Design an enzyme around this catalytic site. Structure first.
Site, PDB file in Angstrom:
ATOM      1  CE  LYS A  94      -2.192 -10.966  10.030  1.00 33.74           C
ATOM      2  NZ  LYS A  94      -3.101 -11.352  10.774  1.00 33.74           N
ATOM      3  NE  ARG A 113     -12.656  12.490   2.053  1.00 42.22           N
ATOM      4  CZ  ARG A 113     -13.525  11.218   1.987  1.00 42.22           C
ATOM      5  NH1 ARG A 113     -14.688  11.366   2.486  1.00 42.22           N
ATOM      6  NH2 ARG A 113     -13.159  10.069   1.674  1.00 42.22           N
ATOM      7  CG  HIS A 170      -9.456  -1.527  -3.524  1.00 43.66           C
ATOM      8  ND1 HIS A 170      -9.365  -2.394  -2.877  1.00 43.66           N
ATOM      9  CD2 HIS A 170      -8.723  -1.610  -4.697  1.00 43.66           C
ATOM     10  CE1 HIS A 170      -8.586  -3.389  -3.365  1.00 43.66           C
ATOM     11  NE2 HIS A 170      -8.036  -2.867  -4.438  1.00 43.66           N
ATOM     12  CE  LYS A 193      -4.101  -0.451   2.497  1.00 39.54           C
ATOM     13  NZ  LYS A 193      -3.931   0.990   2.375  1.00 39.54           N
ATOM     14  CE  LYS A 242     -15.797   3.135   2.298  1.00 41.72           C
ATOM     15  NZ  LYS A 242     -15.890   4.391   3.134  1.00 41.72           N
ATOM     16  CG  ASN A 292     -12.009   8.698   4.775  1.00 37.07           C
ATOM     17  OD1 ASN A 292     -10.829   8.102   4.366  1.00 37.07           O
ATOM     18  ND2 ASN A 292     -12.998   7.893   4.305  1.00 37.07           N
TER      19      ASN A 292
HETATM   20  N1  LIG Z   1      -5.045  -4.996   4.514  1.00 39.55           N
HETATM   21  C1  LIG Z   1      -5.960  -5.345   3.815  1.00 39.55           C
HETATM   22  N2  LIG Z   1      -6.261  -6.317   3.244  1.00 39.55           N
HETATM   23  C2  LIG Z   1      -7.353  -6.403   2.375  1.00 39.55           C
HETATM   24  N3  LIG Z   1      -8.022  -5.240   1.765  1.00 39.55           N
HETATM   25  C3  LIG Z   1      -7.760  -4.209   2.072  1.00 39.55           C
HETATM   26  C4  LIG Z   1      -6.539  -4.008   2.940  1.00 39.55           C
HETATM   27  N4  LIG Z   1      -6.443  -2.606   2.914  1.00 39.55           N
HETATM   28  C5  LIG Z   1      -7.324  -2.024   2.212  1.00 39.55           C
HETATM   29  N5  LIG Z   1      -7.998  -2.843   1.540  1.00 39.55           N
HETATM   30  C6  LIG Z   1      -9.125  -2.604   0.477  1.00 39.55           C
HETATM   31  O1  LIG Z   1      -8.938  -1.399   0.134  1.00 39.55           O
HETATM   32  C7  LIG Z   1     -10.098  -0.414   0.509  1.00 39.55           C
HETATM   33  C8  LIG Z   1      -9.778   0.616   0.735  1.00 39.55           C
HETATM   34  O2  LIG Z   1      -8.458   0.907   1.645  1.00 39.55           O
HETATM   35  P1  LIG Z   1      -7.874   2.315   2.236  1.00 39.55           P
HETATM   36  O3  LIG Z   1      -6.780   1.830   3.029  1.00 39.55           O
HETATM   37  O4  LIG Z   1      -9.236   3.135   2.696  1.00 39.55           O
HETATM   38  O5  LIG Z   1      -7.463   3.039   0.716  1.00 39.55           O
HETATM   39  P2  LIG Z   1      -8.085   4.245   0.016  1.00 39.55           P
HETATM   40  O6  LIG Z   1      -7.270   5.323   0.648  1.00 39.55           O
HETATM   41  O7  LIG Z   1      -7.819   4.018  -1.228  1.00 39.55           O
HETATM   42  O8  LIG Z   1      -9.504   4.500   0.589  1.00 39.55           O
HETATM   43  C9  LIG Z   1     -10.633  -1.214   1.659  1.00 39.55           C
HETATM   44  O9  LIG Z   1     -12.197  -0.991   1.869  1.00 39.55           O
HETATM   45  C10 LIG Z   1     -10.546  -2.654   1.331  1.00 39.55           C
HETATM   46  O10 LIG Z   1     -11.595  -3.156   0.458  1.00 39.55           O
HETATM   47  O1  LIG Z   2     -15.661  15.235  -8.955  1.00 42.64           O
HETATM   48  C1  LIG Z   2     -14.850  14.928  -7.977  1.00 42.64           C
HETATM   49  O2  LIG Z   2     -13.582  14.561  -8.468  1.00 42.64           O
HETATM   50  C2  LIG Z   2     -15.297  15.325  -6.556  1.00 42.64           C
HETATM   51  C3  LIG Z   2     -15.838  13.936  -5.861  1.00 42.64           C
HETATM   52  C4  LIG Z   2     -14.469  12.761  -6.029  1.00 42.64           C
HETATM   53  C5  LIG Z   2     -15.079  11.500  -5.164  1.00 42.64           C
HETATM   54  C6  LIG Z   2     -14.517  11.576  -3.602  1.00 42.64           C
HETATM   55  S1  LIG Z   2     -12.909  11.088  -3.454  1.00 42.64           S
HETATM   56  C7  LIG Z   2     -13.311  10.847  -1.719  1.00 42.64           C
HETATM   57  C8  LIG Z   2     -14.895  10.465  -1.764  1.00 42.64           C
HETATM   58  N1  LIG Z   2     -14.534   9.000  -1.729  1.00 42.64           N
HETATM   59  C9  LIG Z   2     -15.399   8.475  -2.613  1.00 42.64           C
HETATM   60  O3  LIG Z   2     -15.712   7.175  -2.841  1.00 42.64           O
HETATM   61  N2  LIG Z   2     -16.055   9.589  -3.253  1.00 42.64           N
HETATM   62  C10 LIG Z   2     -15.500  10.794  -2.685  1.00 42.64           C
HETATM   63 MG   LIG Z   3     -10.358   4.472   2.585  1.00 44.16          MG
END
Ligand SMILES: Nc1ncnc2c1ncn2[C@@H]1O[C@H](COP(=O)(O)OP(=O)(O)O)[C@@H](O)[C@H]1O
Ligand SMILES: O=C(O)CCCC[C@@H]1SC[C@@H]2NC(=O)N[C@@H]21
Ligand SMILES: [Mg+2]
Length: 444
Positions: free
Chosen positions: A202, A292, A236, A159, A238, A290
């Site tokens: 992990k 924010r 990744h 990561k 939602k 996050n």
């Molecule tokens: N250690 C891990 N093992 C498995 N999946 C992961 C792990 N870390 C992150 N993920 C996957 O990536 C998604 C986003 O991770 P995150 O660390 O929040 O990165 P981002 O900054 O891209 O949101 C998580 O919801 C999960 O689905």
């Molecule tokens: O149009 C844009 O670029 C602004 C919104 C971008 C999506 C943001 S990124 C952080 C947050 N997480 C998401 O899954 N969507 C918003």
């Molecule tokens: Mg995240």
């Protein structure tokens, strides 16, 4: 309350913030790109300033243009929403330097939690459970580097320490094959967010995504507002979110909630924020914060009654938290379906003119979107155009209402993921609850 604020965002979140402002009697300044003249919130705002051409770099990421608009209109504060500059520490610093209130945390908190390595270190110290990992940046010394993966167990994930997308993520399963596995991630990391620094933790194979909403006034008061489950994901990102998370007991909620609110006090957090966890075998493992407002904040609002944007604004105005922990109650259940202008199967973005639009209604139905009939979804921005949220006295009621609301929703002229959302609501495993973070892509 703040006299007047700049909404430094667009689309649905800009509208969400405008509504909170109107309720509190706060004047609004909508700053917008030339492509965004016809945004609903722009048309509703008290004042509007065009801050540059369509591309985000020239408009919504243009710090000088946003500051200048805030200065010329006589605004006292800036709400960054989510995305764009909301977690840009230099922006937060500049906003305060220029004499404005930044509706968010201190710039230093943003930096602390925006760097994954310092974030994890801060969380461990505060006593927030983390994923056993490298606890630092990765080094070429494979005699001790590849010993990190063995200590924790395979598979592992590479990561980026400044990562936040479909880049800076690498799944490694092989023991010996790691002398060049760190290469793929580092190249993408500097290609995307101009920071090569990467770490190891992990790769949890059966985890759910469970996150804790917090509010903190920056005066020492901090509360948690239950949790959300956001396990339905693609690349990744939602797709569906819900609150409370199924199977989470009042005791587990307070365990994790108390630790998150303590972490807030420890780091001097100010405003709304969310601690994201992977949840597996009854254990929480911190992944990131996050710093924010969260996209899926409405599901928490539905089950607690707390207006999270209005709270952000009261906090920004220097008011201490209006709510004690004892006064936060979880009631009912809410589900959110993100509505994206993209093909429900190939996921090709679908910008364009909406030729026909009808919003769903009903008891427990909440519709969060700037879109209207005749509105053109521009190609320049993220595809999420709305959020449909349904609440019920229980999870089955919320899902039932969502199925019906998704059928009522009409968006013609562009492709949307409405058909995918209908499929998810219809999925027997989703209906049972507790599906993991890998389920949607396996289903697809
Ligand atoms: N250690 C891990 N093992 C498995 N999946 C992961 C792990 N870390 C992150 N993920 C996957 O990536 C998604 C986003 O991770 P995150 O660390 O929040 O990165 P981002 O900054 O891209 O949101 C998580 O919801 C999960 O689905
Ligand atoms: O149009 C844009 O670029 C602004 C919104 C971008 C999506 C943001 S990124 C952080 C947050 N997480 C998401 O899954 N969507 C918003
Ligand atoms: Mg995240």
């Amino acid at each position: 309350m703040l006299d007047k604020i700049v909404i430094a965002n667009r689309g649905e979140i800009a509208l969400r913030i405008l509504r909170a402002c109107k309720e509190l009697g706060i004047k609004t300044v909508a700053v917008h790109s030339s492509a965004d003249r016809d945004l609903k919130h722009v048309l509703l705002a008290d004042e509007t300033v065009c801050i540059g051409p369509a591309p985000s770099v020239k408009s919504y990421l243009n710090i000088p243009a946003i500051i200048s608009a805030a200065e010329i209109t006589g605004a006292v504060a800036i709400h960054p929403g989510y995305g764009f500059l909301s977690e840009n520490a230099n922006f937060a610093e500049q906003v305060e330097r220029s004499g404005f209130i930044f509706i968010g945390p201190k710039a230093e908190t943003i930096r602390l939690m925006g760097d994954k390595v310092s974030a994890i270190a801060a969380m461990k110290k505060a006593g927030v459970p983390c994923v056993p990992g490298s606890d630092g940046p990765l080094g070429d010394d494979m005699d001790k580097n590849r010993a990190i993966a063995k200590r924790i167990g395979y598979p592992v994930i590479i990561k980026a320490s400044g990562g936040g997308g479909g880049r800076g993520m690498r799944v490694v399963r092989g023991d010996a094959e790691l002398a060049q596995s760190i290469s793929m991630t580092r190249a993408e990391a500097k290609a995307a967010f101009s920071n090569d620094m990467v770490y190891m933790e992990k790769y949890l194979e059966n985890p759910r995504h469970v996150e804790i909403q917090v509010l903190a006034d920056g005066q020492g008061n901090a509360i948690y507002l239950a949790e959300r489950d956001c396990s339905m994901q693609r690349r990744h990102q939602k797709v569906v979110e819900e609150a409370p998370a199924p199977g989470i007991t009042p005791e587990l909620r307070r365990y994790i909630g108390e630790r998150c609110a303590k972490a807030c006090v420890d780091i001097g957090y100010r405003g709304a924020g969310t601690f994201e966890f992977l949840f597996e075998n009854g254990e929480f493992y911190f992944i990131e914060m996050n710093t924010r407002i969260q996209v899926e904040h409405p599901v928490t609002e539905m089950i607690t009654g707390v207006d999270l944007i209005k709270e952000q604004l009261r906090i920004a105005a220097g008011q201490p938290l209006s709510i004690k922990q004892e006064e936060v109650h979880v009631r009912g259940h809410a589900v959110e379906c993100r509505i994206n202008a993209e093909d429900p199967n190939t996921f090709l973005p679908s910008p364009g003119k909406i030729t026909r639009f009808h919003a769903p209604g009903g008891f427990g139905v909440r519709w969060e979107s700037h879109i209207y009939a005749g509105y053109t979804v521009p190609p320049y921005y993220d595809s999420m155009i709305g959020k449909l949220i349904c609440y019920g006295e229980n999870r089955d009621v919320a899902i039932a209402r969502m199925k019906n609301a998704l059928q009522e929703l009409i968006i013609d002229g562009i492709k949307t993921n409405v058909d995918l959302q209908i499929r998810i609501m219809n999925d027997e495993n989703f209906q049972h609850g507790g599906t993991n973070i890998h389920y949607l892509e396996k289903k697809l």
